[PDB]
Design a protein around this ligand. Structure first.
Ligand SMILES: C=CC1=C(C)/C(=C/C2=[NH+]C(=C\c3[nH]c(/C=C4\NC(=O)[C@@H](C)\C4=C/C)c(C)c3CCC(=O)O)/C(CCC(=O)O)=C2C)NC1=O
Ligand SMILES: C=CC1=C(C)/C(=C/C2=[NH+]C(=C\c3[nH]c(/C=C4\NC(=O)[C@@H](C)\C4=C/C)c(C)c3CCC(=O)O)/C(CCC(=O)O)=C2C)NC1=O
Lengths: 728, 728
C-alpha cells in the first residue's frame, strides 16, 4: 500500500533453493494434479521406471502397479496434509515410492533400493533406538556428544558432527564422531554465510536432507512451470530435491562425497544441525531417514526443554539477588548509598570488573574508578538522549595520546531516573579471545564468464584469528537483569521522589496560613494611622498599598496551590449587581491608572448570582493583562452585556501582535515570554490561568479573539438563581 | 494420642494406581532381581506358559526359550534403565515378551499374540502414515481433528476423542470420531476429578495405556511385596498393570468394554489425551502400541511448538499495540487525555466492555459509566494498599437493596502512580455461560459399613449448567499486557511529575524574589515614621515587628527551598568577634523577653571566620527553640568557648521530656509536634534543620545532648586562619 518495492540486503539469501526444477538422479519424480492428471515428470522416468509419464495422462496400473495406485488414490481423495510411502517392485528393481502434497500439487518420488536387504531395519526400531538414547541426557553437552556417536554407529558415516548456531548466526562444531584417519573439526567456527537464511528457514520446515552423490548431475523435471499456475513446482518437501550447486561446490572443496543433515529446531529457530559426511557415495534407505525425521522432532523438543530449564534457573537465581537488593534499597535511607556498596550492591547483580552508580550529580565507583569512563560514555549518549539502555563489548580503546585512557572495552548502562540522571554502569576489561575458523574467511567473489560468482572458500584449513579490544559479551540474561533492575529502580525512585510533593504541600499550606495574620495586622495598623501629617499620610498610603499588594500575592499563591492540588476554588454564588461591580472596578482602575484610557459599554443593573470576589479578581486580572500587553496609549474598550442565560463581558485592546502559539499558551502559567516583556517582567502569568479556573468554577468560560494584532476577550458565565431551603 | 488431627483434602489422589499388585489377565508377569533371580510372578504363569516361576529360582532355556534369556541377559548386564521386547513362541502360541526395569527390579511381561496374523500387523503402515502426516499440520485445531479421524480408521475403535485440559484441570472433548450410531460426546466438559493428579503424572511418565477388557478380573502377583525391600512392586511402566477399579467402574457405566488412551505432554504438563473406546473387548498388538509411543512423542513435540508459536504471535501483536499507546501517551500534553480517548487508546489493548482511567482524582469512562465499580474496588483495595494489580472474573453483583450498585462482572485494575492514585480499570459485563457437563458432577462418595467409597457417577447423560454473572476470564496475555502497561505508564508518570516538581520550584523561586520588595518598602516606611504621638510610635513598632517576622519567614522559606533543591545555603565567612555578637544577641533577647532567664558563659574576644548574619540566624534559632521547648521559668544557660581551632557554643535548658523519636527527628522539617505545641503553633520546626545545614555549610556541626529532660546543644565551628601580606 506504500507504493514501494524494497531491494534485498544480501545476495546470499537470494537463491530460490526450494524451486530448483530438478532432482538428484538417484530417483525419479512425477508431479500430479489434484484430480490425478500428470503435470510434469523427471526426464529419467523411462530409464528408471520403464515407462513414459506423458503429461495430461493418468498413471496406469501397468506403469506404477496396484500399491502405488492405492497410495495415490488414498492421497488425492484424502483430507488435510498428505504424506505416505510404499515399497513396490517396478520392472526388476525394488523402489521406495514416496508421496506427499504441498500447495495443491501431488508428488510421487521413486528411490531405488537395489542391492539392499528388504526390511533389514524398520523405522520404528531405529526411532526407538535413538529416542531411548536421546532421553537419557540431562545436559545438551552430553546429549549432543552421545547422539553424534549413536548416529555414526547407525549410519556408518565417515563423520558425524553436532553444529550449534551462535547468536550472530555463525556456528561452531560442538560435538564430533569421525573415522580415525580423518582430521577433527571439533570446536571450529564457520561464518553465517555457510548456511544462508533461506536454508535455515527451509530446514525448519523440512528437517532432513540427503545428498547421495555430491558429484551428481541434476535431472531436470520438465515442464519447469506448473501448467495450472505457470509457477514453479515448490519442492520444499521433496526428498529428491536438487540441492544448490554452490553447496555441492562447498562440499567438493571439503572432499566430501555424500552428505546428510538433521535439523534441531528450538523456539521456532534453527538451533543447530547434525551433519554427516561420507567420502564415497552413500544412500540411506527411506525408512531410516523417516526414523531420523522422527528423532529430529523428539531431540528438538528435549533440547528446548534443557535450554529453557537452564535459562529459567539462571533467571531465578538472579531474581533472588535483584529482589533482595530492591528490599535493601527500599529500607535504606539513601538509595545512592544502598546501591553503592562494594559488598552486594549492583556490582554483584551482573558479572563485571567494576560498576558506577550516578544520580543527582553524585557518583561512586565500585571495584575501581570509572567516573572518566562513565562521563565519556554520557558524552557519547548525549547524541541519542532518548536512549535508556546502552551495552557494548567493543568500546573504542583510547589512543596513546594520554595515559588517562581506560581499557574497559565493555560498558552496560541503564537509566533509572532520566530527569535526575540516575545511571548505573557495569564495566568489563578486554578479554583476549582466540577463534579457530574452519578456513580463512576469504571473500565470496570470483570473476569469469558468468561475471562475479559467490564461490565458497577454496580451503578449510583451521585458521586461528586473535581478537583484541573486545570484552566478554553481555549475555541476554545480563541484559534482561539490567532492564528489570532499571524498572525496579524507576519504581523505587518514583516512590521516593513523590514524597517531595507532600512536603511542599505541607510547607506551602502552613506558610499560607501563618503569613496572613502579620499582613492583616499591618493593614489594620495602617488604617488606624490618624494621617494627621502629610508625611504620615504619604507613608500610610504607601504602607496600605504595599500591604494590599502582598495580600494579593499571598492570595495568588493560595489559589495556585489549591488549583495544582485539585481542591479547586470554593465559589459562593450570590445575587450580585454585575453592572455596579464592573463600573466600580473600571472607575477605580482609571483613577489608579490615569494614563490607561478605558472605554466602557456596560449594560445597566446587570444582576447575576455570581461570586463578587472572584468576578472582581477576574476583572482585575483582565485589566492588568490589557495594561501589560496592550499597546501604549491605545484605549481599552470594556463591554458588559447579558446574552440570554449568559453574561458576556468583552475587553478589546490593541497589541503588538500575538502569535497563535502565544494565544494557545495565553493561559499557561509562568510563561517565559512574560519575563522578557519589559512591561510584564514582574508578571507571573497565572492571571489567565486563575481566571480560567474561576470561570470553570462558575460553570463559565473565557473566550479569546485576536485579530489584526487586536485581542478581544469575552467572559461567558451562566445565569443562575441561588437555591433556598424550606421546611416544605 | 498423636497430638494431631489431619483433614482430608481429596480421596481420589490417595489411591496408589502405580503399585496395584495385580495385572490384567491378558498376559503374565515375572519379576526379577538385578542378579536374574525370580522375585515374584503372576499366578497364571503356569496356565499361559506351562511352567512355574518359583520365587528364588532362575529361568532356564527349556522354560522360556533361548530368545527370552538372550534378551534378559542384555538387560541384567546392561547399564541404566532397560526396555526391550522379543517375539518368541512359548508352548504352541506366540508371546510378545516385553521386559523393562524400574527401581532395580526387572520385569518380564508375556502378552499372547494369539488369534491374529502378521498380515494384521499391517497396522504398522497406518502408524507410519499418522506419524508422518502429523508433522505437516499448521495448527492444533486441525491437528486434533485430523488425528482423531486417522486414529479411528487405523485402530477401528468405536470411538476416539481428543480431550484437552483446561487451566483448572477440568477437560473438554475438543474433537471426536465415532461410530454413526453412538452418541456424540464432542464439546462436553468433565471435571478435574475424572483424571486425578496421580494419573496425570503417571500418564506424563508412561504415555500409552490400554485396558483390553474393562470387565477383567485382576490377576494378583504373588508375593505382593518384594522380599529385597518389603515394598510394593512399582509397576508404573508395566503394560500389564492393573488399572484402578474406580476407573473400570467409570468405563463400565459408559458401556465401554475396552479402552486406549495416548498422552499429549506440553511444557512438561499433561496437555491432553486421545482416548479410544470399544463397546466390546479389543486388544492392540504390542508392536502397534510401540508405534503409538513414538506417535505420542512426536505429536507432543508438534503441539508444543504450535502452541508456543500462537502464544508468541499474541504477545507480538500485544507489544505492538502497547508500544504504540506508550508513544501516543508520551507525545501527548496530558497523558490522561491521550489514554482516555474512546476512539483509540487503552480500550484497544485488552478486550473490555468499557474502561475507566483514573489519575489524581480525575475519572474518565469509556463506553459507559464505571465509577461505582472502580470506587468499590478501591474501597476493597484500600485494605491491601501494597497491591498494584487486581483482577477478577466474578465480581459480586449488587443486591436490590440500593440503586447505586455497579453491575459489572469482571474487573482488571493496575496502579501506575501510587501517590496520584493512577488506576486503569478494564471492565467486562455479564457473559452468560452455558456449560454442557458429561453428567452432573455430584459428589463421588457413598457411605457404607466401610465408610465413604469413591463411587463414580452412575450416568453420563449431559447436564447443562447455566453459569450466570461471569464474564470472559482475563487470559494470561491480558494480565501480561496489564503488567507491562503498568510499567510503561509508571515511567511516563515519573518523567512528567519531575516537571511538576521543577514547576513548583520555579514558582517558589519567583515568589521569594518578588515578596522581598514590598516588605522592604514597608520596613523603610515604618523606619521613616516620625513617631510624634505615642499611638503613632506603638503603631510603628507593631508594623516594624510584623515586617521583621515576615522577613524572617521569607528567609526560612528561601532556605528550605534551597536545601530541598540541593542549592544549599550561601554563606559569607568573615572574621567576626563571636563574643560581642553572642553577648549582643543575648542582651537583645533578654531585653525583648525579660521573663526568659538567660545564663551566659561567653568567653571574651572569641573570634572566628563566620557569616555574621548566618551565625546570628543560628543563635536566634537556638534561642527560639529553647524558648518554645524549654520549661517556663527555667533558666537557659548559654556557654561560648573556643576549643583550639573550633568555637563551641552550648545552650542548656530544661525540657518537659523529649522522646527518642522526637530527639532523632529534631532536625526534621514540618515536625508534627510543632503544630500541636500551643506555644509553637506558628513554628514550622525548620529552625534546627536550617541551623544544621548552616553548620555543615561552615564545615561545622551541631551536637545534641539531652539528659534527664535537660537538652544541651553544642555548635562546633572551625576557626579559619587569617591571611595578610608579608615582606622582609
Ligand atoms: C563442517 C561444517 C559444515 C558446515 C558449516 C556446513 C554447512 C551447511 N550449509 C548448508 C546449506 C547451504 N549453503 C548454501 C550456500 C552457501 N554456503 C556457503 O558456504 C556460501 C559459499 C554459500 C553461498 C554463496 C546453500 C545454498 C545451502 C542450502 C543447500 C540446499 O538445501 O539446497 C547445509 C545444509 C545442507 C547439508 O545437509 O549439507 C550445511 C550443513 N556443512 C558442513 O559440513
Ligand atoms: C469421555 C470422557 C472421558 C474422560 C474424562 C475420561 C477420563 C479418564 N480418567 C482416567 C484415569 C483415572 N481416573 C481415575 C479416577 C477417577 N475418575 C473419575 O471420573 C472419578 C470417579 C475418579 C475417582 C474418584 C483414576 C484412578 C484413573 C487412573 C486409572 C489407572 O490408570 O489405573 C483416564 C485414563 C485411563 C484410560 O485410558 O481410560 C481417562 C481417559 N475417560 C473418558 O472416556
Amino acid at each position: 500500500m506504500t507504493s514501494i518495492t524494497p531491494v534485498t540486503l544480501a545476495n546470499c539469501e537470494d537463491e530460490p533453493i526450494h524451486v530448483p526444477g530438478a532432482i538428484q538422479p538417484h530417483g525419479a519424480l512425477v508431479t500430479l494434479r489434484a484430480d490425478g492428471m500428470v503435470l510434469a515428470a523427471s526426464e529419467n522416468i523411462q530409464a528408471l521406471l520403464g515407462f513414459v509419464a506423458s503429461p495430461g495422462s493418468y498413471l496406469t496400473q501397468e506403469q506404477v502397479g496396484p500399491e502405488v495406485l492405492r497410495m495415490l488414490e488414498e492421497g488425492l481423495t484424502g483430507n488435510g496434509p498428505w504424506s505416505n510411502s510404499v515399497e513396490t517392485r517396478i520392472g526388476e528393481h525394488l523402489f521406495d515410492v514416496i508421496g506427499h502434497s504441498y500447495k495443491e500439487v501431488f508428488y510421487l518420488e521413486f528411490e531405488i533400493r537395489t542391492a539392499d536387504t528388504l526390511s533389514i531395519t524398520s523405522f520404528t526400531l531405529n526411532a526407538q533406538r535413538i529416542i531411548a538414547q536421546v532421553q537419557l541426557h540431562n545436559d545438551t553437552a552430553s546429549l549432543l556428544s552421545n547422539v553424534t556417536d549413536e548416529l555414526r554407529r547407525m549410519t556408518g558415516y565417515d563423520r558425524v558432527m553436532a553444529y550449534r548456531f551462535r547468536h550472530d548466526d555463525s556456528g561452531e562444531v560442538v560435538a564430533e564422531s569421525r573415522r580415525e584417519d580423518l582430521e577433527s573439526y571439533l570446536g571450529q567456527r564457520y561464518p553465517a554465510s555457510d548456511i544462508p537464511a533461506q536454508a535455515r528457514r527451509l530446514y525448519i520446515q523440512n528437517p532432513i536432507r540427503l545428498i547421495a552423490d555430491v558429484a551428481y548431475t541434476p535431472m531436470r523435471v520438465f515442464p519447469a512451470l506448473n501448467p495450472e499456475t505457470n509457477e514453479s513446482f515448490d519442492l520444499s518437501y521433496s526428498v529428491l530435491r536438487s540441492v544448490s550447486p554452490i553447496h555441492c561446490e562447498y562440499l567438493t572443496n571439503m572432499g566430501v562425497r555424500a552428505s546428510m543433515s538433521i535439523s534441531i529446531v528450538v523456539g521456532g529457530k534453527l538451533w543447530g544441525l547434525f551433519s554427516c559426511h561420507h567420502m564415497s557415495p552413500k544412500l540411506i534407505p527411506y525408512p531410516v531417514r523417516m526414523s531420523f525425521q522422527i528423532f529430529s522432532q523428539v531431540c528438538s523438543a528435549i533440547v528446548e526443554r534443557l535450554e529453557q530449564g537452564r535459562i529459567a534457573e539462571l533467571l531465578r537465581v538472579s531474581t533472588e539477588r535483584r529482589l533482595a537488593l530492591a528490599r535493601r534499597a527500599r529500607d535504606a535511607d539513601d538509595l545512592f548509598g544502598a546501591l553503592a556498596h562494594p559488598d552486594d550492591g549492583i556490582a554483584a547483580l551482573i558479572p563485571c570488573d567494576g560498576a558506577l552508580v550516578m544520580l543527582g550529580g553524585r557518583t561512586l565507583s565500585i571495584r575501581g574508578d570509572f567516573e572518566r569512563q562513565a562521563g565519556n560514555v554520557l558524552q557519547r549518549l548525549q547524541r541519542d538522549p532518548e536512549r535508556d539502555i546502552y551495552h557494548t563489548d567493543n568500546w573504542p580503546q583510547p589512543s596513546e595520546d594520554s595515559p588517562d585512557g581506560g581499557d574497559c572495552c565493555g560498558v552496560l548502562a541503564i537509566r533509572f531516573h532520566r530527569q535526575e540522571s540516575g545511571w548505573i554502569f557495569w564495566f568489563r576489561h578486554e578479554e583476549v579471545h582466540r577463534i579457530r575458523w574452519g578456513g580463512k574467511p576469504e571473500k565470496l567473489l570470483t570473476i569469469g564468464p558468468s561475471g562475479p560468482r559467490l564461490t565458497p572458500r577454496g580451503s578449510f584449513e583451521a585458521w586461528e584469528e586473535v581478537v583484541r579490544g573486545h570484552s566478554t559479551p553481555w549475555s541476554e540474561t545480563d541484559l534482561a537483569i539490567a532492564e528489570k533492575l532499571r524498572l525496579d529502580l524507576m519504581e523505587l525512585c518514583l516512590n521516593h521522589a513523590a514524597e517531595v510533593d507532600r512536603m511542599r504541600q505541607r510547607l506551602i499550606a502552613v506558610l499560607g496560613h501563618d503569613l496572613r495574620n502579620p499582613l492583616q495586622s499591618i493593614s489594620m495598623a495602617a488604617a488606624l494611622l490618624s494621617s494627621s501629617d502629610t508625611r504620615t499620610t504619604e507613608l500610610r498610603q504607601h504602607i496600605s498599598a504595599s500591604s494590599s499588594r502582598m495580600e494579593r500575592l499571598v492570595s495568588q499563591i493560595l489559589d495556585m496551590s489549591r488549583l495544582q492540588s485539585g481542591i479547586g476554588l470554593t465559589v459562593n454564588p450570590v445575587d450580585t449587581d454585575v453592572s455596579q461591580l464592573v463600573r466600580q472596578i473600571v472607575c477605580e482602575t482609571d483613577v489608579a491608572y490615569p494614563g490607561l484610557v478605558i472605554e466602557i459599554a456596560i449594560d445597566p443593573q446587570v444582576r447575576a448570582v455570581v461570586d463578587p470576589d472572584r468576578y472582581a479578581q477576574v476583572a482585575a486580572n483582565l485589566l492588568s493583562n490589557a495594561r501589560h500587553h496592550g499597546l501604549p496609549g491605545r484605549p481599552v474598550l470594556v463591554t458588559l452585556t447579558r446574552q440570554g442565560d449568559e453574561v458576556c463581558l468583552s475587553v478589546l485592546n490593541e497589541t503588538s501582535g500575538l502569535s497563535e502559539a502565544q494565544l494557545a499558551n495565553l493561559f499557561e502559567p509562568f510563561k517565559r515570554e512574560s519575563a522578557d516583556n519589559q512591561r510584564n517582567r514582574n508578571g507571573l502569568g497565572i492571571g489567565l490561568y486563575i481566571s480560567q479556573a474561576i470561570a470553570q468554577a462558575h460553570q463559565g468560560r473565557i473566550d479569546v479573539d485576536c485579530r489584526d494584532d487586536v485581542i478581544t476577550f469575552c467572559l461567558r458565565l451562566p445565569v443562575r438563581q441561588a437555591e433556598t431551603g424550606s421546611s416544605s
